[PDB]
Design a protein around this ligand. Structure first.
Ligand code: MG
Ligand code: MG
Ligand code: MG
Ligand code: MG
Ligand code: MG
Ligand code: MG
Ligand code: MG
Ligand code: MG
Ligand code: MG
Ligand code: MG
Ligand code: MG
Lengths: 141, 185, 126, 57
RNA sequence: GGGUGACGGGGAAUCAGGGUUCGAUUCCGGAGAGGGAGCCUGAGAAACGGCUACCACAUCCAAGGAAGGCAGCAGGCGCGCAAAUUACCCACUCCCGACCCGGGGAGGUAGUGACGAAAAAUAACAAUACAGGACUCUUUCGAGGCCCUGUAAUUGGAAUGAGUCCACUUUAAAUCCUUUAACGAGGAUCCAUUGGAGGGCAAGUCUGGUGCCAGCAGCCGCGGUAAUUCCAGCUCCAAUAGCGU
């Protein structure tokens, strides 16, 4: 069983210490590893430039093309395959335009039917894509 | 380095299980019986009750004839009687924990308007209060949630400098007096 | 006629050469008396002119038939033009100030730092 | 494989409709009044196997 | 020995009891003035709104020479997901000086400000037409009304702040509130919003369109021509000056 006694503190606290690494969420957050693998260098969003509209194909039980945007991030030069959500919104996006890109809601782990798209587009040229979908603001010219 | 405070808190705590059904039912019923503008205004009362409940609990953990207990518990009971919630004779601390929401909502200017006749419905009462028509003691307590001290109950009435209280009439009747004078007459 | 007044927390500050107190002002249904009307009302009450009286800091209350502020009375003006803020005097025109505008004096003095001796140049400057 | 053509097919070809008009709706306390009134006094009827605040036969 | 998305602390967020995470950041202590080093004066510095070198940047030169350091306050550029006006004043709070008098971007005041926090409007009352149900009455139908609730007619005047605005107050000089006259409400107006409405999870097996498409969906899933899940319209649900990610 457990170490239990009274001048143990060290053994107790050190054993916990060694084990905490076997936790998955903790090793993520303490080995730098994942902050290195983050395109969003430990960031909530990332501005990046669009360099090709790429149709992603959904995972089997659903059949559908998912119309993503290949973004090169600005802070890195780390490329991305972000999602353009909502219907016909890919059309608002036109190549080389300065999207803001956020996470897809799972703080890593790709979501949905899509394979590997970790990110969604938020703002195309400083505008916000909700406003364009709704019809509120417009892409300038 | 400046003057300034930076000392502020929140006055309410949101519920965890956000769609419980039974909770939503009870809160809305509270809103109906006492014409509250918003769910959270209920949750502000609940929270001021809860603080009291924590404070009471904490005192019951102290051994009796522990100075800290005696003084602080008495002050809490004194504070609670002052507002019209506990009765003298009932003052001894265990009775705090058997004390509910409705007791604390019952002592608002909005109630103690509508309670003291004066209004004509609780929503009317709340409108009155806002519209500077009702004065506590000698000030025009604009604010509904003004907890009315038991001490300060019998000094609730209409505001002197107002249509209802016995002053200059409002701008609607002034207009309708001008219309009857110049236009019609 | 119908204002009223009271005199709270009265005190005889011998060694600032003054009486100083907290003015109370009841005045229901009128729009916070100007301080000139308080002075003349205090003058006839304390029987010692307006010219040595200085009053300020008047805050009305809610509802609006009670203001309250601070007032003091000097022995003579000769005393009041000595033991008083300069602003409070020219509040009723008796110790007015220059119109140099701070920024201009500092700019002027940063030139001058540039030059030695020459009283005429240091007089000129800007 | 698969194109990027159709994109806004359905957002495009829906039958367009007006957003109607009705009224200036009660907001704030008034709203809360209204809803408390229409669950706790007006109806309160004899039951017939449960209710439905947006039912439609 | 190595690392730190490490200045120490007071403290902050959660929290039953234990805990976990945070702490650049108004108090206290440290360290630094691009980088390193050396020093002069001085009670006190290894000073940077002091010098002397070097390195890195960079500015006039009549090309011999000469000058420079915002991690003060404003502001600019850049970086970036990420952050305010080259405003006014020494009146308060304190400091410095030979000084009761001078100086202080310390500090105070305004401006920007949905960082966040406290209060708190967007309607209230009446009779009507009615639409209902505890009472009294009536076999039921119907009626008497202390009780009442919905929808209308805005039917009815009464009440009011948003706002516009003389004036006072405020104040260093202003504003802002506060005080206050004069104007100021029929909603077609002074229009509430964000997100939902298969389950988890509060709320339509409604109508139209699309037909594994386009799209939704944190998860389970929905979509291949009666889609409760998509795009719409209706109604409804939640919170509400807030609510999404
Ligand atoms: Mg480091
Ligand atoms: Mg410090
Ligand atoms: Mg620098
Ligand atoms: Mg140093
Ligand atoms: Mg040095
Ligand atoms: Mg500097
Ligand atoms: Mg910001
Ligand atoms: Mg400063
Ligand atoms: Mg807030
Ligand atoms: Mg409005
Ligand atoms: Mg659900």
């Amino acid at each position: 069983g457990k170490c239990r006694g009274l001048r143990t503190a060290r053994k107790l606290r050190s054993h916990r210490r060694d084990q905490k690494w076997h936790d998955k969420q903790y090793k993520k957050a303490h080995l730098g590893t994942a902050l290195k693998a983050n395109p969003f260098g430990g960031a909530s969003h990332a501005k990046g430039i669009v360099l090709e509209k790429v149709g992603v194909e959904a995972k089997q039980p659903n059949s559908a093309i998912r119309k993503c945007v290949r973004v090169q991030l600005i802070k890195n030069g780390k490329k991305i395959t972000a999602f353009v959500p909502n219907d016909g919104c890919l059309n608002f996006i036109e190549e080389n335009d300065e999207v803001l890109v956020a996470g897809f809601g799972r703080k890593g782990h790709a979501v949905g039917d899509i394979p590997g798209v970790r990110f969604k587009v938020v703002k195309v040229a400083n505008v916000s894509l909700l406003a364009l979908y709704k019809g509120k603001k417009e892409r300038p010219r | 380095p400046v003057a300034r405070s930076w000392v502020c808190r929140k006055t309410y705590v949101t519920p965890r299980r956000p769609f419980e059904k039974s909770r939503l039912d009870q809160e809305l019923k509270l809103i109906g019986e006492y014409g509250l503008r918003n769910k959270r205004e209920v949750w502000r009362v609940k929270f001021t009750l809860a603080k009291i409940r924590k404070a009471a609990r904490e005192l019951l953990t102290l051994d009796e004839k522990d100075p800290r207990r005696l003084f602080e518990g008495n002050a809490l009971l004194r504070r609670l009687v002052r507002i019209g919630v506990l009765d003298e004779g009932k003052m001894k601390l265990d009775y705090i924990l058997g004390l509910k929401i409705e007791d604390f909502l019952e002592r608002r200017l909005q109630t103690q308007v509508f309670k003291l006749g004066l209004a004509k419905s609780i929503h009317h009462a709340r409108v009155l209060i806002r519209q500077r028509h009702i004065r506590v003691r000698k000030q025009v307590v604009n604010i509904p949630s003004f907890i009315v001290r038991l001490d300060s109950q019998k000094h609730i009435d209409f505001s002197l400098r107002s249509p209802y209280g016995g002053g200059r009439p409002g701008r609607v009747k002034r207009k309708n007096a001008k219309k009857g004078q110049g236009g019609a007459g | 006629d119908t204002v009223t007044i009271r005199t709270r927390k009265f005190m005889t500050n011998r060694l600032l050469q003054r009486k100083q107190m907290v003015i109370d002002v009841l005045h229901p249904g009128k729009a916070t008396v100007p301080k000139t009307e308080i002075r003349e009302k205090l003058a006839k009450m304390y029987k010692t002119t307006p010219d040595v009286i200085f009053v300020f800091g008047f805050r009305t209350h809610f509802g609006g038939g009670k203001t309250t502020g601070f007032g003091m009375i000097y022995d003579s003006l000769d005393y009041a033009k000595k033991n008083e803020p300069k602003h409070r005097l020219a509040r009723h025109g008796l110790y007015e100030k220059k119109k140099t505008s701070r920024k201009q004096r500092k700019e002027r003095k940063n030139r001058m730092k540039k030059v030695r001796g020459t009283a005429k140049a240091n007089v000129g400057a800007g | 494989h698969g194109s990027l053509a159709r994109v806004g097919k359905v957002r495009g070809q829906t039958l367009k409709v007006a957003k109607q008009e009705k009224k200036k709706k009660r907001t704030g306390r008034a709203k809360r009044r209204m809803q408390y009134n229409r669950r706790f006094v007006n109806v309160v009827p004899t039951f017939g196997k449960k209710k439905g605040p947006n039912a439609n036969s």
